[model samples]
Target: MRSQVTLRDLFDRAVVLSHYIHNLSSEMFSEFDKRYTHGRGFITKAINSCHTSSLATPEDKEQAQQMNQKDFLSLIVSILRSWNEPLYHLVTEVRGMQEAPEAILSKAVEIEEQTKRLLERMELIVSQVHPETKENEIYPVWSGLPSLQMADEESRLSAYYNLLHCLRRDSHKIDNYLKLLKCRIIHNNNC
Candidate 1:
């Protein structure tokens, strides 16, 4: 059975996940230029959105304080769940394509690793908070259709680029949510 998890644990995990996303975004753009400008911009915008959302007002902070740990974690998990299909398709396409660039492949690998780590953290938190929960139960199934279809080489790369943008944007939202949660936890603790 699952044991009860503290708000502190959830807050800690969120902090780690947020920092990880920021690092991932920076790493993706370290060699940034015109070729990947649009892609980079999407990622940057996602990060920016997260930061913007984290600037919670006193009212927002108060509302967040009332959220239970399980519900809070479920919300976080739901956001992460939204990431599965696009990321799965992106990585699968990267691996399946013979002409995928070395740079893209390498970066995709890094992103995948980071994604896995984040999920692992999520799993740990869920297992602690809800022991009876199965693996699939903790991580909701991806029932959505694939984000991209394998077409021509140019189209395939274009699809990957587009999905990357979506992932970044989603990541930003997740980051923002985590930050808000973190802020609430801090405020509650200090009160």
Candidate 2:
């Protein structure tokens, strides 16, 4: 005989299970990178492509340049690019082999672990950068009390869409590789 679980209880359990899987997947990256480097390279390029492109088209750029706030808002797209090199190096570090020159798997693990924490913080930042009004107005407050907000919704949406897209894509890559690592670990144990 089994006890009946309430819907809320079931949902809570699902959430807990999801979080557990997420944390476990993150941990798995430390092991997976040991055998695979291709996944890491793919992530780096995808993230870079998003980082370099203008959030707005050249026509939109002309409008954005007319306003100080909108100009600053546009810069956030590039700021994300600034994060690329460190992340690229961090990925490379994790893929080092035991026999390779200057192998630093331990340091790589540290960087990945810290980077995970940093990414979580970025989630908050993304949510806070919202559109004030759907117009040509670009000087809306990015993080403070709501003021007269005016900015093209498309650009704001694009910024966050790409931001979350990068997060999800790269995180998924690390997760898939992590699963690959686990299978390898289990395989090696039987040998």
Candidate 3:
């Protein structure tokens, strides 16, 4: 039988599950990239080329811990909520594709399902703390997928590849930031 669980367990599991999606997204990108290399027009440009450091840097973690504890949990909620739109867009694109292997299709759905559960836990955790004082409206860095028109198959493939990379990158960032914040808020340990 199971015993009592702590907030640490709650958060640590959330961190790893985000990594699962992160890992899957990365693998899906690479596999799809290599499998469809015949007409590698703009696809070649997006091959492992997502280099902008958005939210997962070391300084980013430290700075969050440096803020007020009230703001810590609030910031975590805001950050997690910001990904909802992007994740929906990503899975919509991935699942709509008939050419992607079922290997890719099923996992895309699975990742979205897990993210939904993660967001549920975020709702639970937020109930335990006071809400943020200021404006809570947050937006994803990306307004939408780069190429909605997708003139050709190559463009569609390249757009999917790019979206996958961004999700993978941001998911890992969310995982990292969650652990650091949990350490500060729950475990009360140095980050």
Which digits, one per residue and each the tens of the lDDT, describe model 1 over residues 63-128? Answer: 655656556666566556556655565556657745535676677676666766676666666666
CA lDDT for candidate 3:
0.62
Model 2 stretches astray by more than 4 angstroms: 1-48, 51-150, 186-190
Q: Which parts of model 3 have CA positions greater than 4 angstroms off?
A: 1-6, 37-59, 131-137, 145-149, 188-191
TM-score (all chains, Cα) for each model? 0.59, 0.26, 0.71
Which of candidates 2 and 3 reaches a greater lDDT? 3
Number of the predicted model whose TM-score against the real structure is largest = 3
lDDT of 2 by residue, 141-178 (tens): 22211111215434432333333344344444333332
Q: 21, model 2: CA deviation in Å?
A: 7.9
Q: Rank the candidates by lDDT, best first.
A: 3, 1, 2
lDDT of each residue in 46-73, candidate 3, tens digit only: 3353323343334465575566766555
How far does residue 174 in candidate 3 sit from its true spot (Å)? Answer: 0.8
Q: Give the CA lDDT, 0 to 100, for residue 90 in model 3.
A: 64
